[PDB]
Design an enzyme around this catalytic site. Structure first.
Site, PDB file in Angstrom:
ATOM      1  N   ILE A 295       8.318 -11.169   3.679  1.00  0.00           N
ATOM      2  CA  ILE A 295       7.162 -10.281   3.671  1.00  0.00           C
ATOM      3  C   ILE A 295       7.229  -9.394   4.905  1.00  0.00           C
ATOM      4  O   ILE A 295       7.369  -9.893   6.028  1.00  0.00           O
ATOM      5  CB  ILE A 295       5.842 -11.070   3.637  1.00  0.00           C
ATOM      6  CG1 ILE A 295       5.822 -12.013   2.436  1.00  0.00           C
ATOM      7  CG2 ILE A 295       4.655 -10.122   3.567  1.00  0.00           C
ATOM      8  CD1 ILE A 295       4.547 -12.807   2.313  1.00  0.00           C
ATOM      9  N   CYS A 296       7.129  -8.083   4.696  1.00  0.00           N
ATOM     10  CA  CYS A 296       7.004  -7.125   5.792  1.00  0.00           C
ATOM     11  C   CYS A 296       5.521  -6.979   6.097  1.00  0.00           C
ATOM     12  O   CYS A 296       4.827  -6.136   5.529  1.00  0.00           O
ATOM     13  CB  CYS A 296       7.639  -5.789   5.427  1.00  0.00           C
ATOM     14  SG  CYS A 296       9.058  -5.337   6.446  1.00  0.00           S
ATOM     15  N   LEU A 297       5.026  -7.822   6.998  1.00  0.00           N
ATOM     16  CA  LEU A 297       3.617  -7.838   7.354  1.00  0.00           C
ATOM     17  C   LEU A 297       3.477  -7.731   8.865  1.00  0.00           C
ATOM     18  O   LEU A 297       4.396  -8.052   9.621  1.00  0.00           O
ATOM     19  CB  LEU A 297       2.928  -9.108   6.839  1.00  0.00           C
ATOM     20  CG  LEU A 297       1.399  -9.107   6.816  1.00  0.00           C
ATOM     21  CD1 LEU A 297       0.865  -7.959   5.975  1.00  0.00           C
ATOM     22  CD2 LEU A 297       0.883 -10.435   6.290  1.00  0.00           C
TER      23      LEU A 297
ATOM     24  N   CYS B 209      12.958  -5.391   8.525  1.00  0.00           N
ATOM     25  CA  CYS B 209      13.133  -4.026   8.038  1.00  0.00           C
ATOM     26  C   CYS B 209      13.925  -3.185   9.031  1.00  0.00           C
ATOM     27  O   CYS B 209      14.770  -2.377   8.633  1.00  0.00           O
ATOM     28  CB  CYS B 209      11.773  -3.391   7.754  1.00  0.00           C
ATOM     29  SG  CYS B 209      10.410  -4.060   8.737  1.00  0.00           S
TER      30      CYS B 209
END
Ligand code: ATP
Ligand code: MG
Ligand code: MG
Lengths: 147, 985, 76, 75
Positions: free
Chosen positions: A83-85, B580
């Protein structure tokens, strides 16, 4: 550690969140399985997603480790469930609890952020052809998050 | 030509240029007692060109109190002659010599001169010459629990690096017309007023890209100023800034001038009135020695103390010192004049060795100029210290009996310590214990545990080991060496090769711990420190923690029922980058290095393990399908590592390496640009590739480029190692094979039920049966940084530099790549010596059993800037439980192995508290909100049976206790904290 | 009242405080100027480690006083 | 009065504000004009970053002052 986890578990027990359900797996307090219901006003509506929450020894000081288990077609979630949180990262400090994290993940489900994506192809589809993204997300939720 | 296989950890502290300049400097050392030999050891390990010793005095017995290169068979021999032979073995690149006569002119041959155990007249005679010839002069002295250091590097010392920190760098968002530079979001520049910076890659203000350093005016944590840039432009966007460190001119004063008006360096700000006293006291000591044929005051002698005080008053009057002499402290200095402690010797030796390295390398800020230190709080008070008990007994411990006495010596000899780890701090601690005579009595014992093996890079700071000892176990070598140093310890040291952790409680159990006296940690990770701290808290044993990092160090003490534990405080956590950023949008070399490490692991470690597990387990396929998050990629890995892409020669390995180059450096970038074209904009209309995101560009393979060839060689070699084929290195074969390569076409894809299962089954049946492959296994690549012939760091460097070339990032060399990827911790010998000295100074306090918290000291220091500080430990918090005072940390409940219902009834009846949660380990044994049926099932069982049922594993035979954590509420419903429960099985 | 805090790495910080301020306010100011959370800060003055809940006047801290901001190290 | 806000891309936005207006109101105006959430706005004037809960007058912002607007990159 153990006292903090027990406090949070008791707090969750007192008032049912009605949108999340987190509890220890078996009897391991540091390993939890949580359930999130897809937002009504989202492509993921009518879906149940299971998450695995590994807890840190320094909790609440260090952040937890949340991972999706159900397959989801989201720009900020890859195939491994990562999860990119933000409130799972530097933005998080020992002031919030797992209920906040579950609500935050529900919100991230409600509206993706393609400006800083984790799955570039899905973000490109979302930016360019929104309808195709909606169809793909609905199909994925139907065939993975239901049953 | 620096041997990076030996100085690997030190180069990260000093650098290539610093060590290059250091390796051309000569050091002379006068005096070969404990302090002199410690300084010589640290210098030899550091790596100066050579060391020369001068000490014609014959050896005496008391000299063995702190000299660990002297033995009782060497009595009557000059110290230099018997020490040089043992010192010449520490480092093979540093010759050691002895001079039997010292003349003034001879001093011109040396870059630095260190003087110990020499009268003040001779020191003045030497300094009057060394000052005017530009020779660094350092003078050290150690009297009992007091120490002094003096430095004089000349009138025109040039310091290139002042604080020893890496230059600060950052990315700029915007530069206004008035020089107001602003950082990116939530980024702190960290600059101070007056610093100099240089800018690069600035758009709109090309003039700032010339490289001229400019002043800095810090206007805030995120913005600063450089002045007026009106002419060079109107506004600047983006760009990077790097700090520029300028040399500093430091002027020292000669000893003769410095005696009149010294400039002190204070190690402790709590006692700022003492150094003026010590300055008079040490000069009075020198005068007294000169007036009594070089004899120091006898220990605890009143007549000598009175004469010394008269000398002190005479000196104070002569020097016009406007200070009131403290009679008690001065007479204390007089009493301990003949003392010789190994702890003070180690502390001052580390400090002076660091000063010598500063003088030779012209780096870091040196002491300016006097450094007077004391540890008078360590003097025992529970034994009789008088003239009769402190008199020498003609043994090797006289230098310590002269300070502590015979009774305290007997106390020391009866210790039963436990040392965890045998690293650098472990070796220093063992040396100090051997010198102090720890556990040399009938009831003494020492235990040391460490599971690692000696390596080449360990010899730079772990002085107990030799090149012939590479590959052996650290604990055995340290035990043998310290038995050699002090023969009385033969048969009183036990070495284990076990890792201290939850899996080793069968050896370090209750019986082992209940006989100890103190525990000393010499570890290098936080997990082990916390575990040992918890064990010590449970068993109520004193603990001594110590840590080092480059030139910084700290030491802490944990005392039962008095202070807090090690685990009651927090430390900054290690920084990790978001996934990311690493996956697609890097902007720093660290991101590329991490990505290269992940690529290495995913190419040469995971597929091999999957293939091996498939060939071992008869039913691995079902487990992979129902467990792996991506089973199809596992099947693909097995298929293409077994049948499809299995190499049969090295040429196929080279072709595979070329294909992987195309896959990871030319195709993925094209796909990313297809997804996010360089002209794309965000949802707010701003360009996508702006700020922390850098637009990449594909790499076209060119054999003439060095980086491409390096990557090809490394990948081919690692693939051959995986399949166990012979790997070539001559470039001719690589050029011949890669010349005849025709890349397959590639076109980015735009994307667009039961087929997936069909494909999985097709892949599954394509795999050869395990029966057809028996005895065939593939060797996984286990990461190993310290070996330079495995192509690991070479591959990581090549991949990182290629990815940097993709995103226009300045590539890093192999040295920095090894530092970052390997997570190497910088280390030094001087810091280790200092921390060992501080810990051993605290050990004597622990032995005496001081009951007050104002007598212990936790120490912090940074040798780069000459900073020392000490602070009392934090007392353990108290609380009120059932109208009683309870220590929050060191108190516990002792209960029998009774029923859970009986436990709840006991808590309700005695403490008046309602139990709500009861847990053991990581399992929730009992909770108030559980369904009644489950509780009724679990209520009538004993605690041991309940733990066995919940954890689904039987209790070990050696288990003698259970540690339970309980949360309970009072009658009113308000939560009250209680100490843990120690169930006795 | 103005005080100085010296870090273990050599950096110097200037703080504007008052005698009645508590240690928590000082830690908050240090966090604002450095980003270090208050729970991870170790302040030492005159051999005494400052503890939360007390005031500056309890430690006799006056104007132009010097404090040391230190931290523990994991190597060794 | 009137003020100007310049972004990192060279765009200039003119705003009609008053000295008593809070920073939050100015950020709301910027959100209305550009769609940038206030949490991501960082306004800098005379080398000082404007903070929520204060006013322009607290930063001595006067007629036709120029501010810089930089936005954070969420992770
Ligand atoms: N949990 C543990 N139990 C026992 N010994 C340990 C534990 N963790 C580390 N050690 C030992 O502590 C010592 C740490 O010292 P140090 O870090 O200086 O040495 P090293 O790790 O061998 O060297 P380097 O870090 O330079 O490669 C090593 O002997 C390591 O084996
Ligand atoms: Mg090792
Ligand atoms: Mg180590």
């Amino acid at each position: 550690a153990l006292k903090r986890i027990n406090r949070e578990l008791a707090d969750l027990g007192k008032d049912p969140p009605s949108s999340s359900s987190a509890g220890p797996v078996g009897d391991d307090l540091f390993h939890w399985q949580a359930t999130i219901m897809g937002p009504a006003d989202s492509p993921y509506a009518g879906g149940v997603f299971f998450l695995s929450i590994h807890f840190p020894t320094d909790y609440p000081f260090k952040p937890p480790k949340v991972n999706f288990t159900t397959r989801i077609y989201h720009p900020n979630i890859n195939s491994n469930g990562s999860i990119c949180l933000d409130i799972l990262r530097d933005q998080w400090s020992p002031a919030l609890t797992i209920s906040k994290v579950l609500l935050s993940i529900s919100s991230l489900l409600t509206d993706p952020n393609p400006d800083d994506p984790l799955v570039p192809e899905i973000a490109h589809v979302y930016k360019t052809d929104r309808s195709r993204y909606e169809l793909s997300a609905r199909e994925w939720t139907r065939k993975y998050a239901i049953g | 030509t620096i041997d990076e296989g030996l100085y690997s950890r030190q180069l990260y502290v000093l650098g290539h240029e610093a060590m290059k300049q250091m390796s051309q400097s000569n050091v002379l050392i006068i005096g070969c007692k404990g302090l002199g030999v410690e300084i010589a050891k640290n210098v030899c390990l550091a790596g100066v060109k050579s060391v020369t010793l001068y000490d014609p005095q014959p050896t005496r017995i008391e000299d063995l109190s702190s000299q660990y290169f002297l033995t009782e068979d060497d009595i009557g021999v000059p110290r230099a002659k018997v020490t040089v032979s043992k010192l010449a073995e520490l480092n093979q690149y540093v010759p050691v010599s002895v001079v039997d006569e010292l003349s003034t002119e001879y001093l011109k041959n040396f870059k630095c001169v260190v003087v110990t155990e020499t009268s003040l007249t001779k020191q003045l005679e030497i300094n009057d010459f060394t000052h005017k010839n530009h020779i660094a002069y350092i003078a050290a002295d150690s009297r009992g629990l007091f120490g002094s250091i003096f430095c004089d590097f000349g009138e025109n010392f040039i310091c290139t690096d002042t604080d020893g920190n890496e230059p600060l760098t950052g990315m700029i968002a915007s530069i206004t017309d008035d020089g107001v530079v602003t950082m990116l979001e939530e980024t702190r520049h960290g600059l101070e007023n007056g610093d100099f910076v240089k800018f690069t890659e600035v758009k709109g203000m090309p003039g700032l890209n010339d490289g001229t350093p400019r002043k800095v005016e810090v206007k805030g944590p995120y913005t600063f100023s450089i002045g007026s840039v009106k002419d060079l432009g109107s506004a600047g966007y983006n760009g990077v800034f790097t700090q520029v460190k300028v040399p500093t001119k430091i002027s020292f004063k000669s000893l003769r001038e410095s005696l009149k008006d010294p400039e002190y360096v204070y190690p402790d700000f709590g006692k700022m009135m003492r150094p003026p006293q010590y300055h008079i006291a040490f000069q009075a000591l020198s005068a007294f020695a000169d007036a009594h044929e070089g004899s120091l005051p006898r220990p605890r002698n009143d007549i000598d103390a009175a004469e010394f005080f008269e000398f002190c008053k005479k000196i104070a009057s002569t020097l016009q010192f406007d200070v009131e002499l403290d009679e008690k402290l001065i007479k204390e200095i007089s009493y301990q004049a003949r003392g010789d402690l190994v702890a003070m010797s180690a502390f001052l030796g580390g400090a002076v060795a660091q000063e010598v390295l500063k003088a030779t390398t012209s780096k870091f800020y040196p002491l300016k100029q006097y450094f007077y230190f004391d540890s008078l709080e360590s003097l025992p008070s529970s034994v009789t210290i008088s003239e009769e008990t402190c008199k020498p007994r003609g043994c090797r411990y006289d230098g310590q009996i002269a300070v502590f006495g015979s009774e305290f010596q007997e106390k020391i000899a009866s210790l039963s310590t436990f040392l965890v780890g045998a690293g650098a701090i472990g070796c220093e601690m063992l040396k100090n214990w051997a010198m102090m005579g720890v556990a040399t009595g009938e009831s003494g014992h020492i235990s040391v545990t460490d599971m690692d093996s000696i390596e080449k890079s360990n010899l730079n700071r772990q002085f107990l080991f030799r090149p012939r000892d590479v590959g052996k176990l650290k604990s055995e070598c340290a035990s043998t060496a310290v038995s050699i140093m002090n023969p009385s310890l033969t048969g009183k040291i036990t070495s284990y090769q076990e890792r201290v952790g939850p899996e080793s409680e069968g050896i370090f159990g209750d019986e082992f711990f209940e006989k100890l006296s103190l525990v000393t940690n010499a570890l290098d990770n936080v997990e082990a420190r916390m575990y040992v701290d918890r064990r010590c808290v449970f068993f109520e044993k004193p603990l001594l923690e110590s840590g080092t990092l480059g030139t910084k160090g700290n030491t802490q003490v944990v005392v039962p029922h008095l202070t807090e534990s090690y685990g009651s405080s927090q430390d900054p956590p290690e920084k990790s980058f978001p996934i990311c950023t690493l996956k697609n949008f890097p902007n720093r070399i660290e991101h590329t290095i991490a990505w290269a490490r992940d690529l290495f692991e995913g190419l040469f470690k995971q597929p091999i393990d999957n293939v091996n597990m498939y060939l071992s387990s008869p039913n691995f396929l079902e487990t992979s399908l129902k467990t792996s998050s991506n089973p199809r990629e596992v099947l693909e890995n097995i298929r293409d590592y077994l049948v499809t892409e299995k190499p049969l020669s090295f040429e196929e390995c080279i072709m595979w390496a070329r294909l992987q180059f195309d896959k990871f450096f030319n195709n993925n970038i094209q796909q990313l640009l297809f997804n996010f074209p360089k002209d794309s904009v965000t949802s707010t209309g701003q360009p996508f590739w702006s700020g922390p995101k850098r637009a990449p560009t594909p790499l076209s393979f060119d054999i003439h480029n060095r980086e491409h060839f390096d990557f090809i060689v490394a990948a081919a070699s690692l693939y051959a190692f995986n399949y166990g084929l012979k790997s070539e290195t001559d470039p001719a074969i690589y050029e011949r094979v890669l010349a005849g390569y025709n890349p397959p076409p590639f076109a980015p894809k735009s994307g667009i039920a039961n087929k997936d299962k069909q494909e999985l089954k097709s892949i599954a049946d394509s795999l050869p049966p395990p029966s057809s492959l028996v005895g065939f296994r593939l060797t996984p690549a286990e990461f190993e940084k310290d070996d330079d012939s495995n192509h690991h760091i070479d591959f990581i460097t090549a991949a990182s530099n290629l990815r940097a070339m993709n995103y226009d990032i300045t590539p890093a060399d192999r040295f920095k790549t090894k530092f970052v990827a390997g997570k190497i911790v910088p280390a030094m010998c001087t810091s280790t010596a200092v921390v060992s000295g501080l810990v051993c100074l605290e050990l004597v306090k622990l032995v005496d059993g001081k009951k007050k918290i104002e007598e212990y000291k936790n120490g912090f220091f940074n040798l780069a800037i000459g900073l020392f500080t000490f602070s009392d430990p934090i007392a353990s918090p108290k609380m009120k439980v059932n109208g009683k005072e309870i220590d929050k940390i060191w108190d516990r409940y002792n209960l029998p192995d009774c029923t859970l219902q009986e436990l709840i009834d006991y808590f309700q009846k005695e403490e008046g508290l309602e139990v709500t949660m009861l847990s053991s380990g990581v399992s929730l044994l009992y909770a108030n909100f559980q369904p009644p049926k489950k509780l009724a099932e679990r209520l009538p069982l004993k605690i041991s049976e309940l733990v066995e049922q919940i954890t689904k594993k039987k209790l070990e035979p050696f288990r003698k206790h259970l540690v339970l954590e309980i949360c309970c509420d009072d009658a009113n419903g308000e939560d009250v904290e209680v100490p843990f429960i120690c169930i006795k099985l | 009242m103005q005080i100085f805090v010296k870090t273990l790495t050599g950096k110097t910080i200037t703080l504007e405080v008052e005698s009645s301020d508590t240690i928590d306010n000082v830690k908050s100011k240090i966090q604002d100027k450095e980003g270090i959370p208050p729970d991870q800060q170790r302040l030492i003055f005159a051999g005494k480690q400052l503890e939360d809940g007390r005031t500056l006047s309890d430690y006799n801290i006056q104007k132009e006083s010097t404090l040391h901001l230190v931290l523990r190290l994991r190597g060794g």
